[PDB]
């Protein structure tokens, strides 16, 4: 049974000609298997999303997007920690990675932030992250 690592590496592989649903979805499934999947999965995604290689970053955010839709409380709750959200902020701030990150990637992140503030009202740290970007001019 594929480790989360193996899985994420197939789903975000910069060699990929198209999106790989077998592995995007096997990743969401597997993270949901163990108590500790959600923290690990969230750690692995943050690294990939900060990749300087764009298709890596882009496929990573797809996986993020997918698992937020289909997974439950436990996932949503690891994502809506500042431990994870702060990593998404580093990518969109010019202060941090913002300046040599494509608009593609930064616009993807912001769009996801927004939809989860509407989709997931209870993840209140997500609201706060987004209001912070909004109030700073990034949004």
């Amino acid at each position: 049974p594929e480790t989360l690592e193996a899985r994420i590496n197939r789903a975000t592989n910069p060699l990929n000609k198209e999106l790989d649903w077998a592995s995007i979805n096997g990743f969401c499934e597997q993270l949901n298997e163990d108590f500790e999947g959600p923290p690990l999965a969230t750690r692995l995604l943050a690294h990939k999303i900060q990749s300087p290689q764009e298709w890596e970053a882009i496929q990573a955010l797809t996986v993020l997007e997918t698992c937020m839709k289909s997974c439950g409380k436990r996932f949503h709750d690891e994502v809506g920690k500042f431990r994870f959200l702060n990593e998404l902020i580093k990518v969109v701030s010019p202060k941090y990675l913002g300046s040599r990150t494509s608009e593609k990637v930064k616009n993807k992140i912001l769009e996801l932030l927004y939809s989860w503030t509407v989709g997931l009202p209870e993840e209140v740290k997500i609201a706060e992250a987004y209001q912070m970007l909004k109030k700073q001019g990034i949004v």
């Binding site: 500042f82 431990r83 912070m132």
Partner: peptide, 9 residues
């Protein structure tokens, strides 16, 4: 586990 505090910026 904790968790962190929000960034400013």
């Amino acid at each position: 586990l904790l968790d962190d505090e929000l960034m400013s910026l």
